[PDB]
PDB file of C-alpha atoms and ligand atoms in Angstrom:
ATOM      1  CA  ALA J   1       0.000   0.000   0.000  1.00 44.31           C
ATOM      2  CA  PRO J   2       1.266   3.482  -0.908  1.00 41.97           C
ATOM      3  CA  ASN J   3       2.326   5.604   2.066  1.00 41.17           C
ATOM      4  CA  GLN J   4       0.386   8.806   1.369  1.00 39.53           C
ATOM      5  CA  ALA J   5       1.455  10.483   4.621  1.00 38.05           C
ATOM      6  CA  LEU J   6       2.245  14.198   4.465  1.00 37.99           C
ATOM      7  CA  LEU J   7       5.662  15.508   5.527  1.00 36.39           C
ATOM      8  CA  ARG J   8       5.148  19.092   6.679  1.00 37.59           C
ATOM      9  CA  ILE J   9       8.064  21.529   6.400  1.00 36.61           C
ATOM     10  CA  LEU J  10       7.949  24.329   8.969  1.00 38.24           C
ATOM     11  CA  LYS J  11       9.493  27.794   8.816  1.00 37.61           C
ATOM     12  CA  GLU J  12      12.117  28.493  11.472  1.00 40.98           C
ATOM     13  CA  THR J  13      10.535  31.909  12.114  1.00 42.23           C
ATOM     14  CA  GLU J  14       7.424  30.185  13.551  1.00 42.84           C
ATOM     15  CA  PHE J  15       9.183  28.784  16.645  1.00 39.90           C
ATOM     16  CA  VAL J  16      16.049  23.561  26.752  1.00 41.83           C
ATOM     17  CA  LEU J  17      14.615  20.182  27.874  1.00 40.88           C
ATOM     18  CA  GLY J  18      17.568  17.808  27.422  1.00 38.78           C
ATOM     19  CA  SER J  19      21.082  17.481  25.968  1.00 36.89           C
ATOM     20  CA  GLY J  20      21.866  16.333  20.667  1.00 33.79           C
ATOM     21  CA  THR J  21      19.681  19.083  22.164  1.00 38.51           C
ATOM     22  CA  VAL J  22      15.886  18.834  22.588  1.00 38.76           C
ATOM     23  CA  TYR J  23      14.222  22.215  23.298  1.00 39.45           C
ATOM     24  CA  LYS J  24      10.762  23.179  24.523  1.00 38.97           C
ATOM     25  CA  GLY J  25       8.987  25.967  22.618  1.00 37.38           C
ATOM     26  CA  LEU J  26       5.851  27.258  20.914  1.00 38.48           C
ATOM     27  CA  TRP J  27       4.862  26.828  17.244  1.00 41.70           C
ATOM     28  CA  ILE J  28       2.888  29.749  15.844  1.00 42.07           C
ATOM     29  CA  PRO J  29       1.698  29.165  12.256  1.00 39.37           C
ATOM     30  CA  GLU J  30       1.327  32.397  10.308  1.00 38.68           C
ATOM     31  CA  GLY J  31      -2.195  33.780  10.078  1.00 38.16           C
ATOM     32  CA  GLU J  32      -4.034  31.297  12.279  1.00 38.98           C
ATOM     33  CA  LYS J  33      -4.152  32.562  15.873  1.00 38.82           C
ATOM     34  CA  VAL J  34      -2.857  29.361  17.471  1.00 36.94           C
ATOM     35  CA  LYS J  35       0.115  28.627  19.752  1.00 35.14           C
ATOM     36  CA  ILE J  36       1.153  24.967  19.932  1.00 35.83           C
ATOM     37  CA  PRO J  37       3.499  23.692  22.688  1.00 32.20           C
ATOM     38  CA  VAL J  38       6.134  21.652  20.860  1.00 33.51           C
ATOM     39  CA  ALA J  39       9.441  19.886  21.422  1.00 31.72           C
ATOM     40  CA  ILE J  40      12.262  20.826  19.041  1.00 32.56           C
ATOM     41  CA  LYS J  41      14.957  18.155  18.619  1.00 33.58           C
ATOM     42  CA  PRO J  42      25.544  13.231   7.197  1.00 33.03           C
ATOM     43  CA  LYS J  43      24.970  10.196   9.440  1.00 31.56           C
ATOM     44  CA  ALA J  44      23.021  12.283  11.964  1.00 32.29           C
ATOM     45  CA  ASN J  45      20.768  13.830   9.309  1.00 33.38           C
ATOM     46  CA  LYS J  46      20.150  10.487   7.582  1.00 32.59           C
ATOM     47  CA  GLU J  47      18.848   8.898  10.792  1.00 29.36           C
ATOM     48  CA  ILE J  48      16.647  11.776  11.967  1.00 26.68           C
ATOM     49  CA  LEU J  49      14.972  11.786   8.548  1.00 25.96           C
ATOM     50  CA  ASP J  50      14.305   8.055   8.906  1.00 25.71           C
ATOM     51  CA  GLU J  51      12.761   8.832  12.297  1.00 24.74           C
ATOM     52  CA  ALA J  52      10.692  11.648  10.764  1.00 24.66           C
ATOM     53  CA  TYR J  53       9.511   9.209   8.089  1.00 26.09           C
ATOM     54  CA  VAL J  54       8.151   6.806  10.713  1.00 28.45           C
ATOM     55  CA  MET J  55       6.479   9.441  12.904  1.00 29.07           C
ATOM     56  CA  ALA J  56       4.787  11.046   9.893  1.00 26.85           C
ATOM     57  CA  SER J  57       3.310   7.656   8.946  1.00 21.33           C
ATOM     58  CA  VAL J  58       1.609   6.963  12.305  1.00 19.20           C
ATOM     59  CA  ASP J  59      -1.534   8.534  13.763  1.00 17.54           C
ATOM     60  CA  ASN J  60      -2.865   7.045  17.003  1.00 16.66           C
ATOM     61  CA  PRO J  61      -3.894   8.540  20.374  1.00 13.57           C
ATOM     62  CA  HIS J  62      -1.166   6.497  22.109  1.00 11.70           C
ATOM     63  CA  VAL J  63       1.653   7.210  19.635  1.00 12.54           C
ATOM     64  CA  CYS J  64       3.561  10.496  19.609  1.00 14.31           C
ATOM     65  CA  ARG J  65       2.422  12.690  16.719  1.00 17.38           C
ATOM     66  CA  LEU J  66       4.874  14.394  14.376  1.00 17.86           C
ATOM     67  CA  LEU J  67       4.111  18.022  13.586  1.00 14.36           C
ATOM     68  CA  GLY J  68       6.841  18.594  11.006  1.00 10.82           C
ATOM     69  CA  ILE J  69      10.501  19.241  10.331  1.00 11.98           C
ATOM     70  CA  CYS J  70      12.542  22.410   9.874  1.00 11.20           C
ATOM     71  CA  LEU J  71      15.383  22.375   7.332  1.00 10.50           C
ATOM     72  CA  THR J  72      18.200  24.446   8.821  1.00 11.17           C
ATOM     73  CA  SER J  73      21.858  23.720   9.602  1.00  8.28           C
ATOM     74  CA  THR J  74      20.703  20.434  11.131  1.00 11.12           C
ATOM     75  CA  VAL J  75      17.281  18.907  10.532  1.00 11.65           C
ATOM     76  CA  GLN J  76      15.022  19.591  13.521  1.00 12.36           C
ATOM     77  CA  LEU J  77      12.255  17.270  14.700  1.00 15.43           C
ATOM     78  CA  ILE J  78       9.143  19.161  15.824  1.00 16.16           C
ATOM     79  CA  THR J  79       6.801  16.962  17.880  1.00 15.52           C
ATOM     80  CA  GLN J  80       4.066  17.439  20.467  1.00 16.81           C
ATOM     81  CA  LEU J  81       5.284  18.678  23.847  1.00 14.94           C
ATOM     82  CA  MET J  82       4.582  16.117  26.570  1.00 16.76           C
ATOM     83  CA  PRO J  83       4.795  18.318  29.688  1.00 12.35           C
ATOM     84  CA  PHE J  84       5.247  15.535  32.274  1.00 12.70           C
ATOM     85  CA  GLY J  85       8.330  13.997  30.659  1.00 13.32           C
ATOM     86  CA  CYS J  86       9.116  10.342  30.152  1.00 12.89           C
ATOM     87  CA  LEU J  87       7.263   7.714  32.165  1.00 13.64           C
ATOM     88  CA  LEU J  88      10.507   6.360  33.655  1.00 13.56           C
ATOM     89  CA  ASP J  89      11.388   9.611  35.436  1.00 14.09           C
ATOM     90  CA  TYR J  90       7.719  10.145  36.312  1.00 14.30           C
ATOM     91  CA  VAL J  91       7.275   6.949  38.343  1.00 14.27           C
ATOM     92  CA  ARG J  92      10.619   7.550  40.067  1.00 15.37           C
ATOM     93  CA  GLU J  93       9.734  11.147  40.959  1.00 14.53           C
ATOM     94  CA  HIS J  94       6.164  10.341  42.066  1.00 14.58           C
ATOM     95  CA  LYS J  95       6.489   6.907  43.704  1.00 15.27           C
ATOM     96  CA  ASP J  96       4.530   7.907  46.807  1.00 12.50           C
ATOM     97  CA  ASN J  97       1.540   8.958  44.681  1.00 11.70           C
ATOM     98  CA  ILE J  98       1.059   6.407  41.869  1.00 10.21           C
ATOM     99  CA  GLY J  99      -2.087   4.376  42.461  1.00  7.99           C
ATOM    100  CA  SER J 100      -2.998   1.008  40.989  1.00  3.90           C
ATOM    101  CA  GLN J 101      -5.543   2.668  38.648  1.00  2.14           C
ATOM    102  CA  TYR J 102      -2.842   4.724  36.926  1.00  2.70           C
ATOM    103  CA  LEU J 103      -0.415   1.801  36.615  1.00  3.56           C
ATOM    104  CA  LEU J 104      -2.974  -0.530  35.037  1.00  2.00           C
ATOM    105  CA  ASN J 105      -4.318   2.212  32.758  1.00  2.00           C
ATOM    106  CA  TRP J 106      -0.795   2.975  31.517  1.00  4.40           C
ATOM    107  CA  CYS J 107      -0.371  -0.708  30.632  1.00  4.24           C
ATOM    108  CA  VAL J 108      -3.627  -0.575  28.655  1.00  5.95           C
ATOM    109  CA  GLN J 109      -2.626   2.546  26.728  1.00  2.53           C
ATOM    110  CA  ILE J 110       0.897   1.324  25.938  1.00  2.50           C
ATOM    111  CA  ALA J 111      -0.556  -1.942  24.638  1.00  3.11           C
ATOM    112  CA  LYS J 112      -3.054   0.018  22.522  1.00  2.00           C
ATOM    113  CA  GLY J 113      -0.227   2.032  20.970  1.00  2.00           C
ATOM    114  CA  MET J 114       1.855  -1.072  20.282  1.00  2.00           C
ATOM    115  CA  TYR J 115      -1.630   0.052  16.427  1.00  2.00           C
ATOM    116  CA  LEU J 116       2.040  -0.140  15.427  1.00  2.00           C
ATOM    117  CA  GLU J 117       1.534  -3.848  14.722  1.00  2.00           C
ATOM    118  CA  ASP J 118      -1.441  -2.969  12.509  1.00  2.00           C
ATOM    119  CA  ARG J 119       0.962  -0.650  10.659  1.00  2.00           C
ATOM    120  CA  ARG J 120       3.345  -3.637  10.310  1.00  2.00           C
ATOM    121  CA  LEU J 121       5.912  -1.663  12.300  1.00  2.00           C
ATOM    122  CA  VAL J 122       8.443  -3.054  14.786  1.00  2.00           C
ATOM    123  CA  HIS J 123       9.552  -0.536  17.416  1.00  2.00           C
ATOM    124  CA  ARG J 124      12.730  -2.373  18.566  1.00  2.00           C
ATOM    125  CA  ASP J 125      13.216   0.030  21.503  1.00  2.00           C
ATOM    126  CA  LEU J 126      10.121  -0.089  23.718  1.00  2.00           C
ATOM    127  CA  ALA J 127      11.005   1.018  27.250  1.00  3.61           C
ATOM    128  CA  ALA J 128       9.750   3.203  30.079  1.00  6.19           C
ATOM    129  CA  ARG J 129      12.152   5.954  28.975  1.00  5.61           C
ATOM    130  CA  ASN J 130      10.461   5.930  25.542  1.00  4.62           C
ATOM    131  CA  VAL J 131       6.915   6.480  26.869  1.00  6.00           C
ATOM    132  CA  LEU J 132       5.972  10.143  27.256  1.00  8.13           C
ATOM    133  CA  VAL J 133       3.294  11.589  29.531  1.00  8.43           C
ATOM    134  CA  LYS J 134       0.914  14.168  28.066  1.00 10.58           C
ATOM    135  CA  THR J 135      -1.150  14.066  31.269  1.00  9.80           C
ATOM    136  CA  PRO J 136      -1.046  11.511  34.111  1.00 11.83           C
ATOM    137  CA  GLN J 137      -4.115   9.990  32.433  1.00 14.77           C
ATOM    138  CA  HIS J 138      -2.688   9.899  28.889  1.00 12.27           C
ATOM    139  CA  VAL J 139       0.648   8.421  27.784  1.00 15.89           C
ATOM    140  CA  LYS J 140       2.107   7.882  24.308  1.00 15.30           C
ATOM    141  CA  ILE J 141       4.933   5.803  22.833  1.00 17.39           C
ATOM    142  CA  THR J 142       7.885   7.705  21.347  1.00 15.76           C
ATOM    143  CA  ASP J 143      11.460   7.280  20.061  1.00 14.89           C
ATOM    144  CA  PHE J 144      11.276   5.578  16.649  1.00 11.16           C
ATOM    145  CA  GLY J 145      15.020   5.817  15.982  1.00  9.96           C
ATOM    146  CA  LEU J 146      15.177   2.018  15.712  1.00  8.20           C
ATOM    147  CA  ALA J 147      11.733   1.396  14.201  1.00 10.06           C
ATOM    148  CA  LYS J 148      11.539  -0.775  11.082  1.00 12.95           C
ATOM    149  CA  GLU J 149      10.818 -10.776  10.988  1.00 10.07           C
ATOM    150  CA  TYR J 150      13.518  -8.125  10.650  1.00  9.19           C
ATOM    151  CA  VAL J 151      20.940  -1.921  21.190  1.00  7.44           C
ATOM    152  CA  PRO J 152      19.423  -2.033  24.703  1.00  6.43           C
ATOM    153  CA  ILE J 153      20.258  -5.598  25.727  1.00  8.01           C
ATOM    154  CA  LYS J 154      18.199  -5.658  28.935  1.00  6.61           C
ATOM    155  CA  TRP J 155      14.948  -4.927  27.050  1.00  4.61           C
ATOM    156  CA  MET J 156      15.449  -7.286  24.090  1.00  2.82           C
ATOM    157  CA  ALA J 157      14.072 -10.757  23.512  1.00  5.50           C
ATOM    158  CA  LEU J 158      16.465 -13.698  23.601  1.00  5.13           C
ATOM    159  CA  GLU J 159      16.085 -14.243  19.853  1.00  4.66           C
ATOM    160  CA  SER J 160      17.050 -10.598  19.297  1.00  3.51           C
ATOM    161  CA  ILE J 161      20.264 -10.941  21.311  1.00  4.66           C
ATOM    162  CA  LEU J 162      21.355 -14.251  19.755  1.00  3.85           C
ATOM    163  CA  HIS J 163      20.086 -13.970  16.164  1.00  2.00           C
ATOM    164  CA  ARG J 164      19.337 -10.231  15.685  1.00  2.13           C
ATOM    165  CA  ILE J 165      15.731 -11.185  14.851  1.00  2.30           C
ATOM    166  CA  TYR J 166      13.017  -8.628  15.624  1.00  2.11           C
ATOM    167  CA  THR J 167       9.264  -9.230  15.361  1.00  3.13           C
ATOM    168  CA  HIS J 168       6.111  -7.823  16.907  1.00  3.90           C
ATOM    169  CA  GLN J 169       6.498 -10.624  19.466  1.00  2.00           C
ATOM    170  CA  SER J 170       9.983  -9.363  20.332  1.00  2.00           C
ATOM    171  CA  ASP J 171       8.294  -6.041  21.095  1.00  2.00           C
ATOM    172  CA  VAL J 172       6.043  -8.016  23.461  1.00  2.00           C
ATOM    173  CA  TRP J 173       9.158  -9.038  25.398  1.00  2.00           C
ATOM    174  CA  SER J 174      10.156  -5.376  25.683  1.00  2.01           C
ATOM    175  CA  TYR J 175       6.588  -4.603  26.757  1.00  2.00           C
ATOM    176  CA  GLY J 176       6.973  -7.076  29.618  1.00  2.61           C
ATOM    177  CA  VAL J 177      10.193  -5.410  30.749  1.00  2.10           C
ATOM    178  CA  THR J 178       8.514  -1.999  30.459  1.00  4.28           C
ATOM    179  CA  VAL J 179       5.636  -3.107  32.703  1.00  5.14           C
ATOM    180  CA  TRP J 180       8.229  -4.413  35.167  1.00  2.45           C
ATOM    181  CA  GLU J 181       9.803  -0.946  35.245  1.00  2.13           C
ATOM    182  CA  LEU J 182       6.454   0.636  36.123  1.00  2.00           C
ATOM    183  CA  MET J 183       5.510  -1.913  38.790  1.00  2.00           C
ATOM    184  CA  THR J 184       8.916  -1.513  40.468  1.00  2.00           C
ATOM    185  CA  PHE J 185       8.456   2.294  40.267  1.00  2.00           C
ATOM    186  CA  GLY J 186      11.481   2.697  37.998  1.00  2.00           C
ATOM    187  CA  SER J 187      13.992   0.031  39.024  1.00  2.00           C
ATOM    188  CA  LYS J 188      16.783  -0.824  36.614  1.00  2.00           C
ATOM    189  CA  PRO J 189      16.319  -4.305  35.091  1.00  3.67           C
ATOM    190  CA  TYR J 190      19.138  -6.693  36.031  1.00  4.63           C
ATOM    191  CA  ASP J 191      20.711  -3.912  38.087  1.00  7.41           C
ATOM    192  CA  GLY J 192      24.427  -4.581  38.416  1.00  6.26           C
ATOM    193  CA  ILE J 193      24.541  -7.486  35.959  1.00  2.74           C
ATOM    194  CA  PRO J 194      26.607  -6.489  32.900  1.00  4.47           C
ATOM    195  CA  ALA J 195      24.935  -6.647  29.507  1.00  2.50           C
ATOM    196  CA  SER J 196      27.281  -9.344  28.199  1.00  2.82           C
ATOM    197  CA  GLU J 197      25.922 -11.862  30.735  1.00  2.56           C
ATOM    198  CA  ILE J 198      22.229 -11.195  30.016  1.00  4.01           C
ATOM    199  CA  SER J 199      22.302 -13.737  27.179  1.00  2.00           C
ATOM    200  CA  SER J 200      23.562 -16.504  29.472  1.00  2.00           C
ATOM    201  CA  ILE J 201      21.062 -15.683  32.224  1.00  2.00           C
ATOM    202  CA  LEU J 202      17.981 -15.756  29.987  1.00  2.00           C
ATOM    203  CA  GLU J 203      19.133 -19.082  28.526  1.00  2.00           C
ATOM    204  CA  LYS J 204      19.368 -20.736  31.956  1.00  2.00           C
ATOM    205  CA  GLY J 205      15.724 -19.801  32.622  1.00  2.00           C
ATOM    206  CA  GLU J 206      16.102 -16.830  34.979  1.00  2.00           C
ATOM    207  CA  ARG J 207      13.812 -13.800  34.705  1.00  2.00           C
ATOM    208  CA  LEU J 208      13.170 -10.480  36.406  1.00  2.00           C
ATOM    209  CA  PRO J 209      11.809 -10.889  39.953  1.00  2.00           C
ATOM    210  CA  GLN J 210       8.187 -10.429  40.949  1.00  2.00           C
ATOM    211  CA  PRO J 211       7.612  -6.793  41.957  1.00  2.00           C
ATOM    212  CA  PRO J 212       6.360  -6.414  45.541  1.00  2.00           C
ATOM    213  CA  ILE J 213       3.069  -4.721  44.583  1.00  2.00           C
ATOM    214  CA  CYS J 214       2.239  -7.323  41.916  1.00  2.00           C
ATOM    215  CA  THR J 215      -0.289 -10.067  42.468  1.00  2.00           C
ATOM    216  CA  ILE J 216       0.507 -13.335  40.717  1.00  2.00           C
ATOM    217  CA  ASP J 217      -2.091 -12.345  38.101  1.00  2.00           C
ATOM    218  CA  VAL J 218      -0.025  -9.356  36.961  1.00  2.00           C
ATOM    219  CA  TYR J 219       3.345 -11.103  37.285  1.00  2.00           C
ATOM    220  CA  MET J 220       2.056 -14.074  35.266  1.00  2.00           C
ATOM    221  CA  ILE J 221       1.391 -11.730  32.343  1.00  2.00           C
ATOM    222  CA  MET J 222       4.985 -10.460  32.451  1.00  2.00           C
ATOM    223  CA  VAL J 223       6.338 -14.021  32.586  1.00  2.00           C
ATOM    224  CA  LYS J 224       4.287 -14.898  29.500  1.00  2.00           C
ATOM    225  CA  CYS J 225       5.967 -11.986  27.695  1.00  2.00           C
ATOM    226  CA  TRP J 226       9.364 -13.568  28.464  1.00  2.00           C
ATOM    227  CA  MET J 227       8.832 -17.031  26.975  1.00  2.00           C
ATOM    228  CA  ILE J 228      11.468 -18.525  24.685  1.00  2.00           C
ATOM    229  CA  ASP J 229       8.803 -19.414  22.111  1.00  2.00           C
ATOM    230  CA  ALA J 230       7.876 -16.044  20.622  1.00  2.00           C
ATOM    231  CA  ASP J 231       4.507 -17.297  19.344  1.00  2.00           C
ATOM    232  CA  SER J 232       3.601 -18.440  22.878  1.00  2.00           C
ATOM    233  CA  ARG J 233       3.912 -14.873  24.165  1.00  2.00           C
ATOM    234  CA  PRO J 234       0.636 -12.920  24.309  1.00  2.00           C
ATOM    235  CA  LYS J 235      -0.397 -10.550  21.552  1.00  2.00           C
ATOM    236  CA  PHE J 236      -0.842  -6.834  22.126  1.00  2.00           C
ATOM    237  CA  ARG J 237      -4.590  -7.129  21.475  1.00  2.00           C
ATOM    238  CA  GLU J 238      -4.780  -9.728  24.258  1.00  2.00           C
ATOM    239  CA  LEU J 239      -2.741  -7.571  26.650  1.00  2.00           C
ATOM    240  CA  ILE J 240      -5.295  -4.802  26.060  1.00  2.00           C
ATOM    241  CA  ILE J 241      -8.100  -7.155  27.101  1.00  2.00           C
ATOM    242  CA  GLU J 242      -6.310  -8.525  30.170  1.00  2.00           C
ATOM    243  CA  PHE J 243      -5.150  -5.202  31.604  1.00  2.00           C
ATOM    244  CA  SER J 244      -8.560  -3.646  30.868  1.00  2.00           C
ATOM    245  CA  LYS J 245     -10.290  -6.253  33.042  1.00  2.00           C
ATOM    246  CA  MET J 246      -7.800  -5.632  35.846  1.00  2.00           C
ATOM    247  CA  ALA J 247      -8.231  -1.858  35.502  1.00  2.00           C
ATOM    248  CA  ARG J 248     -11.909  -2.327  36.469  1.00  2.00           C
ATOM    249  CA  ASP J 249     -10.808  -3.581  39.918  1.00  2.00           C
ATOM    250  CA  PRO J 250      -7.265  -2.264  40.377  1.00  2.00           C
ATOM    251  CA  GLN J 251      -6.805  -2.991  44.094  1.00  2.00           C
ATOM    252  CA  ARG J 252      -7.527  -6.670  43.369  1.00  2.00           C
ATOM    253  CA  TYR J 253      -4.402  -6.905  41.188  1.00  2.00           C
ATOM    254  CA  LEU J 254      -1.948  -4.327  42.586  1.00  2.00           C
ATOM    255  CA  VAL J 255      -1.284  -4.025  46.324  1.00  2.00           C
ATOM    256  CA  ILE J 256       0.091  -0.538  47.021  1.00  2.00           C
ATOM    257  CA  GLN J 257       0.246   1.009  50.481  1.00  2.00           C
ATOM    258  CA  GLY J 258      -1.974   4.074  50.675  1.00  2.00           C
ATOM    259  CA  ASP J 259      -3.760   3.170  47.434  1.00  2.00           C
ATOM    260  CA  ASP J 260      -4.707  31.026  22.163  1.00  2.00           C
ATOM    261  CA  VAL J 261      -2.768  27.959  23.302  1.00  2.00           C
ATOM    262  CA  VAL J 262      -3.905  24.787  21.513  1.00  2.00           C
ATOM    263  CA  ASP J 263      -2.562  21.308  22.210  1.00  2.68           C
ATOM    264  CA  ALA J 264      -1.323  19.433  19.152  1.00  2.00           C
ATOM    265  CA  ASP J 265      -4.063  16.805  19.550  1.00  2.00           C
ATOM    266  CA  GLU J 266      -6.632  19.550  18.852  1.00  2.00           C
ATOM    267  CA  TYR J 267      -4.736  21.135  15.924  1.00  2.00           C
ATOM    268  CA  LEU J 268      -5.847  18.698  13.216  1.00  2.00           C
TER     269      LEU J 268
HETATM  270  C1  LIG C 301      13.061  10.154  30.015  1.00  2.00           C
HETATM  271  C2  LIG C 301      13.240  11.616  29.722  1.00  2.00           C
HETATM  272  C3  LIG C 301      12.430  12.807  29.326  1.00  2.00           C
HETATM  273  O1  LIG C 301      11.552  12.398  28.658  1.00  2.00           O
HETATM  274  N1  LIG C 301      12.478  14.178  29.811  1.00  2.00           N
HETATM  275  C4  LIG C 301      11.489  15.220  29.578  1.00  2.00           C
HETATM  276  C5  LIG C 301      10.588  15.181  28.532  1.00  2.00           C
HETATM  277  C6  LIG C 301       9.669  16.190  28.340  1.00  2.00           C
HETATM  278  N2  LIG C 301       8.699  16.168  27.260  1.00  2.00           N
HETATM  279  C7  LIG C 301       9.031  15.844  25.887  1.00  2.00           C
HETATM  280  N3  LIG C 301       8.143  16.089  24.907  1.00  2.00           N
HETATM  281  C8  LIG C 301       8.433  15.790  23.674  1.00  2.00           C
HETATM  282  C9  LIG C 301       9.611  15.239  23.366  1.00  2.00           C
HETATM  283  C10 LIG C 301      10.517  14.993  24.335  1.00  2.00           C
HETATM  284  C11 LIG C 301      11.859  14.349  23.999  1.00  2.00           C
HETATM  285  C12 LIG C 301      12.024  13.724  22.884  1.00  2.00           C
HETATM  286  N4  LIG C 301      13.318  13.229  22.844  1.00  2.00           N
HETATM  287  C13 LIG C 301      13.919  13.635  24.096  1.00  2.00           C
HETATM  288  C14 LIG C 301      15.182  13.456  24.667  1.00  2.00           C
HETATM  289  C15 LIG C 301      16.279  12.690  23.939  1.00  2.00           C
HETATM  290  C16 LIG C 301      15.402  14.018  25.954  1.00  2.00           C
HETATM  291  C17 LIG C 301      14.402  14.729  26.639  1.00  2.00           C
HETATM  292  C18 LIG C 301      13.180  14.893  26.063  1.00  2.00           C
HETATM  293  N5  LIG C 301      12.914  14.352  24.793  1.00  2.00           N
HETATM  294  N6  LIG C 301      10.227  15.280  25.595  1.00  2.00           N
HETATM  295  C19 LIG C 301       9.632  17.252  29.202  1.00  2.00           C
HETATM  296  O2  LIG C 301       8.708  18.273  29.020  1.00  2.00           O
HETATM  297  C20 LIG C 301       8.515  19.044  30.163  1.00  2.00           C
HETATM  298  C21 LIG C 301      10.521  17.311  30.246  1.00  2.00           C
HETATM  299  C22 LIG C 301      11.441  16.302  30.439  1.00  2.00           C
HETATM  300  N7  LIG C 301      12.364  16.439  31.538  1.00  2.00           N
HETATM  301  C23 LIG C 301      13.459  17.370  31.366  1.00  2.00           C
HETATM  302  C24 LIG C 301      12.214  15.700  32.769  1.00  2.00           C
HETATM  303  C25 LIG C 301      13.503  14.917  32.985  1.00  2.00           C
HETATM  304  N8  LIG C 301      14.341  15.606  33.941  1.00  2.00           N
HETATM  305  C26 LIG C 301      13.969  15.184  35.277  1.00  2.00           C
HETATM  306  C27 LIG C 301      15.729  15.273  33.677  1.00  2.00           C
END
């Protein structure tokens, strides 16, 4: 099928978060009285254009939307500003305030976004750092610098480490690790263990431990994402169904103590 997506080129005259350098700013298209909060981000240019290609070809409420590119000294990525940052730093900074409702709803939304399978698109870098927070009730998947059967070792499936094979089911493995990051409130997977030994550990049968707040119901879903047989791992459509049921009774599945500005989503 022909990819009829539109690549919008933005004037520099129409415009620091992290350090390349990603900046926070406002996009003001000429004429229309609208201010849009945005994030402004030969080998370097070739890869950011590949990333712009992917983001321009996706359109889903749980996938970061591309607004356009600006052709200056270096090509700039202009995307929607997610004011609450990445989900990894968010759960670390707000441990003592994340309830079971938010955790289970985030798992639903991330599984919904991983739409990417409908687009026949493999992310190859799903992680808590690559999930941005528009609002505490709305997260989106980002970072398509590795998007493409067809590197962060501690998030990859065993077949990806041994044979460099990436499928939608290898993304399911990374989804399981990402859920583990949220349920541990931002712990580092295999903390201390060097990356070179991850291949030997997964082969012996060892996995990430059961997070303290996780009932066996939730931890069983993560274990199923970490099976050797990729086709035995659950599908993203099934993970949507499972986490949705649990989100209707969150305290039964997570045990936690004490439980003219226009946004880009409205500039269509
Ligand atoms: C895990 C880090 C992080 O996401 N920090 C962050 C993100 C904000 N929002 C936002 N919106 C759109 C695009 C980005 C973005 C895209 N690529 C990057 C990189 C490589 C680094 C940082 C942001 N990127 N981000 C945001 O908006 C307020 C703030 C932050 N922080 C600065 C919080 C992290 N801080 C505690 C270090």
